[PDB]
């Protein structure tokens with residue numbers, strides 16, 4: 001199971017970890033991907049998860065987009081977790097760098113409530129441009145299911161823990 005996590009609330013846990021390495025170790029039922037609406041897994045968490053699947057996540061995602069069209073910002077889809085998890089929940093948080101609406105971050109986190117337990121990154125953090133402290137606050141105030149947050153950057157992990165209200 002999940003180990004070495006710091007408990008933030010009744011249902012939110014956090015660890016300084018590479019989510020790919022965490023997924024390979026725990027083999028969770030659900031790993032959350034920081035997806036974009038096109039499921040183009042180029043960089044950040046998406047690029048790293050996709051590379052760990054030997055591009056199988058991207059091939060599967062391109063078939064999903066060909067059939068269904070793009071996701072909405074704030075939306076999600078459930079696809080295979082390949083060698084990382086039973087399922088991958090591709091969640092689209094708003095990308096501030098692309099001028100997307102930051103109020104959609106709460107809608108993005110609501111997707112986590114459809115899964116009892118998840119391994120996840122902070123939505124809209126990193127290359128998505130949002131304030132990670134604000135993302136963690138929205139996470140704790142929105143997600144009611146068991147979420148295990150993997151924060152890649154040590155300095156950010158330390159700041160998130162020390163500033164947590």
Ligand SMILES: O=C(O)Cn1ccc(Br)cc1=O
Nearest residue numbers: 125126132150151152153156
């Ligand atoms: O650490 C993360 O999980 C995401 N991330 C990565 C690197 C930096 Br710097 C900021 C940030 O939000």
